[model samples]
Structures are given as C-alpha cells and as structure tokens.
Target: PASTLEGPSRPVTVPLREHAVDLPDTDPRVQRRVTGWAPEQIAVALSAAPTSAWVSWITGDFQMGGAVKPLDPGTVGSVVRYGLAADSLVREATGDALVYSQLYPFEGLQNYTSGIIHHVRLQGLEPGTKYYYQCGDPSIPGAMSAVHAFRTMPAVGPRSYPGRIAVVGDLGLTYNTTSTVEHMASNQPDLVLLLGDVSYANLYLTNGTGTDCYSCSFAKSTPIHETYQPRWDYWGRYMEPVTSSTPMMVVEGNHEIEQQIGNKTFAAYSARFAFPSMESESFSPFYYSFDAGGIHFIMLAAYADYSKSGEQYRWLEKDLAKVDRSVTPWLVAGWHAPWYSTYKAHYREAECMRVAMEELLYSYGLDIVFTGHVHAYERSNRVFNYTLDPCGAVHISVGDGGNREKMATTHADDPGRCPEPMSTPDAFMGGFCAFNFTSGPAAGSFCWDRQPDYSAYRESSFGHGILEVKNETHALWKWHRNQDLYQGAVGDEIYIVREPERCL
Candidate 1:
C-alpha cells in the first residue's frame, strides 16, 4: 500500500469472484409491504443546501397488463409531518404528485403504469440535526407511514462535513445487491451516492422473463428493449429500509434509458426518485448538483448529452463556477461510466465524455470523480488526459455493487485483450474519442502492456466504498468486499489528500 500523500500507488488487481443471483419477485423483501394508499419505497434525497431535503415515496398498487389503468396522483394527499421527536410531529409540508407509464404498442407486449408517486420538500430545517417524519395521505385512515428519522447534511462550510458517505453504483435487485447494501448499512454512512444503474429492469422482458446477458439471449425478441417495470418497485421496496432513512443521491446509467413508445426514455427513473434539479438549477433529474457538508457534489448523466455544446455541459459550467472553495472545499462528481477503466467489459467506453468535459473539470480542479458501469472496482491515481499528473482528479469506479450481471474479469491490458480503438467508444453516447497514444509508454497502442501507471488498484468483487473527509485537504476512502465479514475487512484503503494551493 502506498499513501496518496507520497504519490501514485502501484496497480494491483484482485482475482475474480463468484457472481450472486438476483432476488426473485417471490422474495418477501421485494413484495409489496404496504396496504392501500400507504407509502412504499420511501426515500430521502438532499437538496442544494443543508436547509432543505426531499422526501419521496409511492402509494397504491401498480397495474401491469394490456389494459392497465394509471393512478391519478391527485387522488392521494401528498403531505409530510415532521418534528424533532417521533411523538411530536408539529411541522408539516405538502408537495406535488404524479404517475408515469411504460407502454409498448407491439403485439403481446405488456404495459406498466406506476403507483402514484409523491415528493415533498422540507424547508428551513436545522443542518446536521436528526428529524423524524411521516409521509402519505394522513387524511386517509391507516395510510400514513411509520415515523422515520434522518439527519441532514452538515451545514455547507469548508470546516464542516458529514461523518461518512457511502458510494455505490450499478446496484440491481439481487442477493449480491443486498449483501452490498447490508455491508454498507453496517458501516452506518451519513449519506449515500448511487452513481446510476439502480435497478436493471431492462434485463427483463415485459412478460417478466429475465436473463443475465440481455443482448446475448433476448435482444431481438422485441421491437424495443422491454422492462419488467415491477423490478423497479421491487428494488425500491428492498432498499427502503436504507433509503428511507439515509439520503441517497442518484445519477442515470445506460440501463436506465428504458425507452418506450414515442422515443420516451427514463420514465421510471425520473418519476421514482426526487432530485435537487430545481434547487440546483439543472432542471433535469438525469443530472444535478447538491451539497452535503463541505462537499459540492455534481452528479452527471453519462447517458445524456455530455458534449461541450449540450445543455448539460452549459449547466455544468455554471454550476462549477458557482462553487466557492471557501465554503465547500471539496468538489466531487459522480456518473454512470468510467473514463479510465482497464476492464475489457467497458474499456474506455466514456472517452468521448471525458474528452468533451475533462478540460472543463480539470480547469475547476475537480478533487475526485466517482463512476460505475464497469461491474468492477478500480481506483486511478491522480490522472488527467490519460497521463499521471499531480494536479489531476482521481477517478474511482465502484460499479461492483453486485447485480446479476457477470463480473468483469479480464483487463484490456491483458495479453492480446485490447479492444479495437473504434469499438472503445460507447455507441449509445454517439462519439469516438479514444485514440492511440501519441506519446508516453503506450504510444501507438490502444491498450497498455501491463496495468497502466495511472490505475492504482482494481478488484473484481462485489463491494461499496465509504468516504470520510477528515479536514480541508485530507479524506479517507475505504472499499469493503461483500465476501469478507463486515467489521474490519477493507479491500482497499487510502488517504486522498488534496493540494488546493498547487492544483488551483
């Protein structure tokens, strides 16, 4: 192990592990727990500031079939009662509600209309204080949820920070996912950052048939990639215990592009989770920024337009410019794909995004970048433009939040394993920016001969990471493997020390 304070650590790769099976619908954890208009899949998300937070949940039962009837969001009262204690809920907030549908006009395709979704924003709250709250239609008998408590992020200041933040991604509804979640919960994180690929509903057909490799088994069965929309509900239900009390911030992943009739996309993703889109002025659920203590978090959408000319990029520029280092000294960003992963599964898949936005982020001196989609864990040393630079941002990929998908075991750098240069770019993102090196040890090559100098450590295991900012310039990061018992098994650990004076 090498300290980041000294320099980049040497690269190390852990042997591949066994893949876990997905939880079936019959599993009690995925079953609908609430009756009638009672809330289910309740979750908390941070707003742009510590003074506010968002509470979201679904009610009623979803309809899945040819003749599905959509629920009217107005039928239920979107209200939340909150206070310092469970016994005394003296404050109240009312918010909007809505429902979305996934439809396929093709023959024999089932349709899905979601339960009424409610979002309420609690405002003017004291930061870093725990508050208990009950949501759902209090007006209806037995409809309100049991009181749940969650602490707000520490006030935005260079000296203040949440105790611990859990970072996981590509987490689907599976036994392995549960293992990752349980392990994460055991550590008791103050906040959670889910870097997309929440529920892999796209792996299923509308008829509920699922496969580990969708393209390999069923890509041509339907006009469009169908999804068992209930899988989303199942994931929410399974994650409620953690999401209900721990604020989770999400960004969209490739799997979340669940396209439907009329080229509609991200229907389930947008309707289910409440983001600080309005508060951050991004105005798109696919991407947004928020503050949790001293960290200014920018959650980007890799599946969306990340080009320099796109609206997301424009918004990102404005967002980055508004960040005050004196207030939120740590600038961290999360997205769905990796720009530095050496795994053969998604080697350099996001090079286009990196090329388009890397300079902009580097100019801002972005401290760290978190991403998923590789189905493996990799930590890069300070890197920018595929080069080892002291002032570069450290890219960490934790896409190993166990989905049923096969683990990415082979490296692009392995003997004769390099992906073709043209094939490296993500076709969904629509650009090819990954070219052979013009200089350095990798000159004229698509892959390195060995583990690149930039990749510090990589492991193909199901796990999650915890980030603890110790001070203005020092933060601790630890990755825990699900195979090991919870208490003291750290797959990888490092102290991420930032040099603002030099980088800025």
Candidate 2:
C-alpha cells in the first residue's frame, strides 16, 4: 500500500488503536481551580460578525449529588470588563446569567445543577484587533475571573480573511483529545470550528461509570442513555486556556442529545454555550449562520427539522440569497454528520438530509462542506449526486478528534464490509434515499466495489485539520496527526481550488 502522504488512490487503513481512554476526574487539567462563586470554565464565542463577540463563563459551584441544591443565577450579575489593552479594561459589557438542571427521576441516577452560566456580548470592537477582558460579578468578593485576551475576526470583505481556521469534531475528554487540542493551539488559529460531538458525556452513566458502547450497557433497561453532566464542566475547565482566548463555533452531534426528565434533551448543551442566534436571524440555536472575515459560515443542524419546508431550510434560503460573492468570497457549511462518508460505520447515513438540502446548497454555490461523526479522516474531490463534478463542493471530514470511540478503520468499499441497505438511514431523520449506485463502477450495488474516484484521501488516524484560505481561488487544507510531536507531521495535504466562474 502506498503511504498516505503520497496521495493513495485506494483507502488506507492505519492500525487502529482501541477506544481512547477518557480523562479521569482526578486529572489536574480538568479539576476545578475555583473555590467559590468565582468564574470558571471561561470561554469566548463569536457574535454575528467581526465587530462583536460573546464572552461567557460559569460562576459559583455546580451541585452533583442526588440532594443537589441548585444555584440561583440571579444571585450574581453577568459583567465583562474589556478594553484594547490588558491594563485598561475601561469598557464594561453587562449581560444575563442562568442555570440549568439535569434531573433523572430514576432511583440511583444522580441529578446535576450547573453554576451560573453568563454570556455577555461585547460590541463596538474593531475588526482584526485584540482585546483583554474579565468576567464575573462586582458585588461579590473575588468573583471575577483572571484576565483573558482574544482577537476579533478580520473585517468582512472579499479581500479580507483570518490567518488560520481550525476544524475539529468528536473531541471527547481523552488524552488523545489533549494531543489534538495541543496541536491546534500550537498552530495559533484565528478561529475554531468544532463541528460537533463536543464532550462525549453521553458515553457515561449518570453515576459516572463510563463504557465504550452505550448500546451494550443501556440495551433495553430504560432505552435511555445517561450522561455524566460533570463531564461538560470538566471539558470546559480543561479547555478554558484555549477557549477563553479563541472563539469556537459549535454545532450539536448525536452525543449532545443527552436525554433527561420527560425526554427533554440538549439541556446542558443549550445552556452552557452562547450562539449568535438572533444576530444571524436563525431564531433557534440548533442552526445558525455567521461570518468570519470573508467566509460566510452556515452552521446547520442535523438533529433539527431539515426538510424543504422547515424553518432551517427557509432561513437557509434567505441567508444564501443575501450572500454576495463579491463581499464574502467563500461560502462554507458545517454540521455534525457527514453526507459523503465512505466509512462502513455511518455509510450514507445522512442521505435523506442530503436529498432535502443538497440541491439548494449546490445551486447557491457552496464552496466547501465540513462534517464530523465518523471517527476517521477522509476528503473528497468536488462531488455532488454521488458524482465527481468540478462545480460540486469539496466535502471533508475531520471527525478524528480523538473521542473515546474506536477509530473507524473499515471502508464501505472494503471487501464484505458494505453495510446493509436497510440499516443505512439515520435513526433521527428517517428516510431512505441511498439506492444502489446507478452510474458508478458499482452500478447496481449500494457499496462501491473499489475506492470511489471522488475520494482523494482516507486515513484512520487521530487528528484535526487546519484550513488556511490563501485567496479567493486557493486554500490549503492540512491534516496534522496527534502522534506527531513537532506538530508538522502532515498526514494529508491538498489545495482546495475553487472556480467560481465555472461553478457559479
């Protein structure tokens, strides 16, 4: 087999390491350093554009035991002091705070109540400028967090662009996860796009006992998989150093759909992070769109209504019509699951979603699509309707962000590895659209007998991707493996060239 760096035509299977070990609570990095109502899990998220951003952090202590007493968010004020310089934090932005609870009526299942989560939006920020800020309540003693700094995205225009954008997904709280994060931080990204599967908290029980396979443990007992809500806190604590400074845009993955009381879901995810819902006119948090420099980012929702007549589709249509190629040269869409994955794990699982939304995105000239779910890395040439076309958008999956799940190693085209046609549809969005290939080499078969010509690269490795937009026509995509010490080990590299004249 040809080395992956040489651009292998066939799928490459690197030796699969078993499920990654989760970061235990005793790990110093995840241990809470805050004592009282002081802010912890500090983070920053982008607002609509480069002119503004959101500063968020959790204040007070979380309650974990069964008899947990929830903290009242009204007890503390959400305030952020920020300015151009580290010493002078003259400008103050005040916002709201709230708390959410994960309650399980089951006898032994523990309840969890989060600390006061605050999200303060800072406006009037100059594009491409750096600012320092602190968040907490002034009324309480030692309640404010330490000084943190972050840079705003560059001005939105065809000629303007951020230095580098990091794309990663399925990032669980594991040792390998740290390696991917360290690699991402070392590269110094201007923006970060967490595609989904944020904490992997769903892999554990409410009592904190974790297993690799949720289906195996919770098979039929209650048919309800439980999550250790503390994992979200641990993730935030561990990621504070990077998140407090850099803006990370996130979408929901299957793991984030943690079921709770009366089947209410996404409580922790919806409460902890702040999204630019209103700014983007998305109305709902499940899906939204924002701009970073010249890039118009549309964060879609796989778990929400995605039919042609749904709210997300309507909003997407309006959003696409508003985008002027002359203003924002790039149009990129990201979500949790992949629509063009060849991995046997989730082969064509999102075909229904694709059928509903692909034509619209194609017509609007979507330049690239990023997805994560499959625990492996793969990149496709410009493709649409299961065919290689120059006008089609390049689809890339960087879902290898070192989650507790085993790395996906088998390809759908592998001998006898093809998934059954009946099991290919997504459970959430119910539909069957992936019929046998009608035109490809595997004409009458659901699985390609060989590596599809559209697949440019495939590898089973734990890593993340960095996208450097060089210009309107050229962009460099580099995948860096976690095992590489110096962080320069490029597992795969390619120039995603876009031709607007041909496509549009």
Candidate 3:
C-alpha cells in the first residue's frame, strides 16, 4: 500500500549545481542523417483505439533564413507499408502531409520552415502482437525508413496490463538526457509516457544560442519569444532508436507554446508528432485519452483553456463520466504541470487547474496522477485537497527526466525558499488559485514551513520511473536514478494499492 507520512516529512537537501549544459551542434545525434528527401526522425504514436496506431516521419531538409519560404506538404507522399512480418509488408496505409513554419516579422530574427511531415494510421492490428512496418514514399526510391517493429497494447481488461510502462518528462536535449534515455531503455518498458516539456527549443535563440533564462536573455530583443526549430528535429532523431519500438503517448506542456508570427503557437510540436485527437473526440491536440489494458489514461493540457466553462473541461467531464470501472479498473490521469508539486521551481503553478477540475476527478475516483515540469521526483500519498485520504489518488511527479537546465533541488517548504503568491500563476496557464490554507497546520500562511504531509517521498535526481501493475488492486512503482548503475538502486519504491469499493 502507498505509505502515509504523518506530519511533514524531512526534506532531502542537496547541493545546488550551477552551469547550463546545451547539446552542441557537432553532436552526431543531432546531425541530419537522410540525404535528399528521405524520411528522418521517424516515430510512432497510438490512436484512441487499440487496433489503430499512427506512424509519422519527416522528409527533406528544413530551411532557416531571413524571409524563409515554407514548403508545400502536398509535394511529398504520406504513406506507410506494414504487415505481421518484415518481409511480408503487403498492407498499406496512406495519410496526409503538411509543413509548418516559425516566422518572426522582426528584423535580425531568422525564420524557420519545417520539412514535410507525414502521418499514416495503420488499422486492424491484433492486440499484444508485434507488427513490422516501414514509412515513406515508395515511388521515390530510397525514401523509405528502415523496417521497425512495435507491439500493440494488450486487450483492455482488468486482468491484463503492459509488462512495464515508462514515465518521463522535461527531457531536453542534453548530456543528462542521454542518462535518462539510457536508463529508461535499460528497463525495456513496453510503453513510454512523456508528460511534456520535450526538446525545450524555446530555451534557445533563433540562431541556436542557448540561454539559462527565457525572459531574461532575449526578452527585450526578440519581437516574440524565438525558438530554434531545428531542436525539434534533433530531438526526434535522438529519440528514434527508443520510439521506433516503444509506443509513446505525449501531451502538450507550457514550453511547447512557442508563439510565432500570426499568433501561431505549438507549430513545431503539433507538426512533428501525431495524436489520436480526432479519434478520441478531442478536436484539439492539447488533450486526449487512451486505454492501455485496464488503465484508461487521460492526458490533459495545462496550456489549454481548462476552465470549467471551456471545451477541455467539458471533454474531461464527459470522459470521466463514461469510464466503466468493470472494463478499465484503473483510471490514471497525466499532464505536464503538477497541481501538488512541492518543488520551489513551480510551486502551486497549476493551482487554478486543480481548483477547476479536482472535484470532478475526485468524484469519479481517479486512481493515479502523473505529472512533470518541476525537474525533480516526488510521490504524494493518497491525497485530496491537501489531506490524506485513502479514496484520493496517488499523485506522482516525475519531472526530473534530465534536460539542459539543471535539476530542481529547492523545496517550497524550505526556510526562506517559499515563493510569493504573485509569482505562481503563469500567463500561459492563466489565473491564480493557490492560496493560504485556512484549515491546515500552516493556516493563514501561503507556504508551509516544512514539507507537506501529503508528500510520501521525494528526491532530486535525473532519471525515469517504471510502473508495474501486478493486479487490479496493487501496482508497483520504482524510480531509478541515472547516477546509480546498480540493478536495485531505486531512489523510491512503493506499492500503490487501491480500495476501489471504498473509493467509489
């Protein structure tokens, strides 16, 4: 069962490490591999239904210059050939191709035009079976990607679960990123969930120069916050080895909102990866839901309009109401930002989101919640409204998946580290709801003088986590740190058991 800590737990203090490490341009992983118009940065995604999956890739080299012209997506063919075996790829699926651009109308700021992106959904797949496939235009010789294989999630049922599910986030392209990926691949998880803050292209200037702070270095110079679009390409290529086989589900984070000319936002993110948005009745790419075995996973968007009156909130309401507990026993939810994080970096950043949707989720008996963005790992005990309750969901924040930015070590409860209330709500997420507790131990105070009681365990480390659902009631979770190479060197381990009858 998930451990319950009585009062505030002791803080695990660590020395602060300065110095931002950016991926160098000379890194082999970031360099272009395909010549001419061959597909590069090939990847796979899951549709809403278990029988269908989407294969997406990029073709042709991107153009980055002043007054750059965008490429016509129609010029490239969007096709994927697949079958049960590598040599017997007789089944074919064809889809759409499109190109997007990041334009800055300001002088001295260069524009970026992406390569043609393709998305093909392969249908009629057998659950829990491996399928080999290739993606590209067959007519164009040598344009197809190498043959890759991926296994579909097991059929949805209370008795079935994936062998292992990897959860990671805030994965910026850096040296620490290699450690996270290597550690994750070592686990050989059947599926991967990227909570958000992928690539972090917005952390750099349009000219590829990196910066520690977004608003500090280039705020006064650029018309809008500029992003190096090539970073997305690099991230895709770097992740191809792992993503080619492991099915990854992603949701948008605040860093993905790289606003460009004409009020274009999330252009690079939306174009590079394919989602089951339309299939899941989510018109926008910001939010969607999928079923993995008995787990009905809902991926929300902090950057989207999540107010009770907005579309996202309405969809969430309907989605939660429709869940049949007998079919999918576990209702797990994920998002980029955490509503219960104790890290000083983004303390109570998503309080407004929590206020709007917490009651709805609680009423539906949500089991587990996964979130990222704080760049540290913390697992909360069964909690609801800052109180420990067995009926509440086990909130786990695994935002420590390493990135170019340094790790987040300071605790909001640490002496003199608690942030001001005014600095919590971000403009991208909208509105403030984090307030001083009126009924808790630290009533009348905005920040707790110590670690909150809801926090079961926490650590500042660069790594990923694996979730193993042993049965309908018990799930084992283990967080592995990158610095430790021992087989059993887990930073945090616990069994999250659910009392469905009592909760429901």
- Top candidate, metric lDDT: 1
Candidate 3 ranges beyond 4 A from true positions = 1-20
Model 2 TM-score is 0.96
Top candidate, metric TM-score: 1
lDDT (10s digit) by residue, model 2, range 282-306: 9877899999989999999999989
Q: Each prediction's Cα RMSD? A: 1.0, 2.5, 1.9
lDDT value for model 2 = 0.88
lDDT values for all models: 0.92, 0.88, 0.86
Residues 1-504 of candidate 1 have per-residue lDDT tens digits of 355788987788877654568899899999998899999999999999999999999999899986999887899999999999999999999999999999999999999999999999999899999999999998899999999999999998988999999999999988999989999999999999999999999999999999998888888766888899999999999999999999999899999999999999999999999999999999999899999899999999898899989999999999999999988999999999998998999898888899999999999999999999999899999999989999899999999999998989999999989988887778777878888899998999888999999999999898999999988899999999998984689999989999999989
Q: RMSD in Å for candidate 3, one decimal?
A: 1.9
TM-score of each: 0.99, 0.96, 0.96
lDDT of 2 at 171: 97
Off by over 4 Å in 1: none
**How many pairs in model 2 have backbone atoms within 3 A of each other, for residues 3 or more apart or on separate chains, i.e. clashes?**
0
